[PDB]
C-alpha cells in the first residue's frame, strides 16, 4: 500500500489531505447474491478487457494502413505538382 511519513502527513494543506442480522436463510441468501454479484463482476471485467485488447489490434492495423495510404496520397499530390 501507499505509505506516507507522519512528518509529511501531519503537515499538509487542508484540501489536499488524505482524509441486527439473522442467522440462517437470510444470510445464506445474501451470500448467494454476493456470489452472483462477484460472478457478474469478474465476467464483464473479462469482457471489457477483451474488448480493449481487441481495439489494440484494431488501432495498430488501422494506423499502419492509414500510414501507407497517406504516403500514397502524398506521392500522388507530389507528382501532380511535379507535372507543372
Amino acid at each position: 500500500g501507499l505509505k506516507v511519513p507522519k512528518a509529511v502527513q501531519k503537515e499538509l494543506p487542508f484540501k489536499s489531505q488524505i482524509h441486527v442480522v439473522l442467522g440462517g436463510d437470510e444470510k445464506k441468501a445474501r451470500s448467494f447474491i454476493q456470489k452472483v454479484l462477484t460472478i457478474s463482476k469478474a465476467k464483464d471485467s473479462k469482457r471489457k478487457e477483451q474488448k480493449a485488447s481487441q481495439r489494440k489490434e484494431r488501432l495498430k492495423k488501422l494506423a499502419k494502413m492509414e500510414e501507407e495510404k497517406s504516403q500514397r496520397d502524398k506521392e500522388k499530390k507530389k507528382e501532380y505538382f511535379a507535372q507543372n
Partner: protein, 90 residues
C-alpha cells in the same frame, strides 16, 4: 418505495445481473438502472396449457429468489464457479 424495497431489494439487482446467472443465455447489453415505477407479478397459465409449462402446486415457490434457489444443478454451477473464483482470487 422503501417499505417493500426490503422484500424486493435482491431480485432487481439479480435482474440487473442476469448476464451471468446461467451460462447459456448472453442477454444483450444494457445497464438497466432500477426504474422509478414498477410492479412485481406472477404469470397465470392458460387453461388449455397443461402438461407443458405450468408449474405445479407444491412447486410454486412464492418468490423468484426462492425459485432460483430451487434447482441444485444451477446452484452447483454457482458453487463451482464461485469456488474457482475464490481460489483464483486468494
Amino acid at each position: 418505495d422503501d417499505n417493500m424495497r426490503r422484500e424486493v431489494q435482491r431480485d432487481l439487482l439479480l435482474i440487473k445481473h442476469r448476464a451471468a446467472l446461467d451460462p447459456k443465455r448472453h442477454y444483450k447489453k444494457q445497464r438497466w438502472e432500477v426504474p422509478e415505477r414498477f410492479a412485481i407479478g406472477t404469470i397465470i397459465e392458460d387453461k388449455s396449457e397443461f402438461y407443458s409449462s405450468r408449474m405445479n402446486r407444491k412447486e410454486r415457490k412464492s418468490t423468484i429468489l426462492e425459485t432460483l434457489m430451487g434447482d441444485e444443478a444451477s446452484n452447483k454451477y454457482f458453487k463451482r464457479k464461485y469456488n474457482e473464483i475464490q481460489e483464483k482470487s486468494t
